[PDB]
Amino acid sequence: AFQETNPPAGPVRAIAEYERSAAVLVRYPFGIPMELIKELAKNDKVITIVASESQKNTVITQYTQSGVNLSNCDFIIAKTDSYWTRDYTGWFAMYDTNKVGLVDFIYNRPRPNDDEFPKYEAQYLGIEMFGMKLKQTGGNYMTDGYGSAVQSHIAYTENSSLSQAQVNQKMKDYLGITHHDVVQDPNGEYINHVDCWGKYLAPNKILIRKVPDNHPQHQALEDMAAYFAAQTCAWGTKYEVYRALATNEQPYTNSLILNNRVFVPVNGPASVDNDALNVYKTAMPGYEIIGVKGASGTPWLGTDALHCRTHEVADKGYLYIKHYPILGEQAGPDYKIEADVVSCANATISPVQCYYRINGSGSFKAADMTMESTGHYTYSFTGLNKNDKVEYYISAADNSGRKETYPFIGEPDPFKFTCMN
Ligand code: NA
């Protein structure tokens, strides 16, 4: 059964989908097209859940026949009731300064093998599992990686024996969430997953579904988009709100961000798909945006598509860069950057650099950041002139062979600010 545990030793920080992923978790019998599994396995580890050695051999034959990169295919043998790995698998969080853990919860649907599955996931990854006593659904959860999470109103109505404050406190204790944004549902739907209408694309970017003016959800979604555009995000700027127009219930927000690739389910028409992919491409410079057609037997649905049938897996040895950027004309008066870098592999970190460029001229220059205290690195931009334009990003490496940048995509989309002092 679900086993409640004490919460993880603090501080805790839930890991966002756009942070480094060591793998992606899918399930057999499949709910996704083989073409998607082949694309995933080209660059990333694909973990497939199977119920037996027999099913594992069936899957290996299908992957071989389809030309899947078998060197990137791993398996977990466990019973499951469904292929909605988004919804019942564990949630990832960093805790105890430099550990990666899994958070289990009471799955909100009567599928006991799905509900039990996180134990097998933690065992496979060799990480600790914590049991947060809330009725939850992964499809209805997203975090920005800076302590905010968005969920539909189901997060309170399915935990109605607790007060909202008790629900928020569990999210704080197990996932480090300091703003549990459970948004109102004016239509009070029986099922309402945030990934059907909203998606953080970055700490400062959110995609909100848009529908035609006469659709019954038109005003509710316009209100949601205005709510996010009017408020401050983790980086101190307003959210950038992007809109994916669903003319006919296309699940365009139900995408998967996996490292530098974004897999977007597409159902047509082709012009409306192209418009939606161009919103993702505009929102996420440097990323590879891939439209993915559905499998004929298990097609994408408006309320259930690619994000619902995948789950990114964090890196147990994550080389994590925590940084709040200095941006625009609001970067001063102190043009000093700070980055906290920790190795969850307990590896030796070296080097920690600021790569920067002035007025878009020449190659990026690397400067070693000063380690003022353990895990705390700084760099001051000096000798700049009024109205100079800066691009910069953070780079770190460790002796486990990990290499990371902040932002994740690195040099293709660095942080930008203007010298106003
Ligand atoms: Na569970």
Residue numbers in the entry: 44 to 464
From the study:
Uniquely among microbes to date, P. gingivalis also produces a secreted PAD (called PPAD18), which protects P. gingivalis during acidic cleansing in the mouth through ammonia generated during host and endogenous protein citrullination. PPAD does not require calcium for catalysis and is genetically unrelated with animal PADs and, like the latter and cysteine peptidases, its main catalytic residue is a cysteine (C351 in PPAD20). In contrast, PPAD citrullinates C-terminal arginines like those generated by the prior action of Rgps17, which may be facilitated by the surface co-localization of Rgps and PPAD20.
We solved three distinct structures to high resolution from different protein preparations, which crystallized in different space groups: substrate-free (to 1.5 Å resolution), a substrate-mimic (1.4 Å), and a substrate complex (1.8 Å). In the substrate-free structure, which was obtained with DTDP-treated wild-type (wt) protein, catalytic C351, nearby C239 and distal C462 residues are covalently modified by what was conservatively interpreted as a 4-thiopyridyl moiety. The C239 side chain is even found in two alternate conformations, one bound to thiopyridine and the other with the sulfur as sulfoxide. This indicates overall flexibility of active site residues in PPAD due to the absence of a bound substrate and suggests that the covalent modifications of the Sγ atoms do not distort the general unbound conformation of PPAD. In addition, segment V226-V237 of the loop connecting blades III and IV, hereafter the “Michaelis loop”, is in an open conformation, thus consistent with a structure that can bind a substrate. In particular, Y233 at the most exposed part of the loop points to bulk solvent. We hypothesize that DTDP-treatment precludes substrate binding and, thus, protects the unbound conformation, while lack of such treatment causes the enzyme to trap substrates or mimics during biosynthesis or purification. In the substrate-free state, the Michaelis-loop containing Y233 is in an open conformation, which enables peptides with a C-terminal arginine to be accommodated at the active site. D130 becomes rotated around its χ1 angle by ~60° upon substrate binding, thereby exchanging its tight hydrogen bond with T180Oγ1 (2.6 Å) in the substrate-free structure with binding of the substrate guanidinium group.
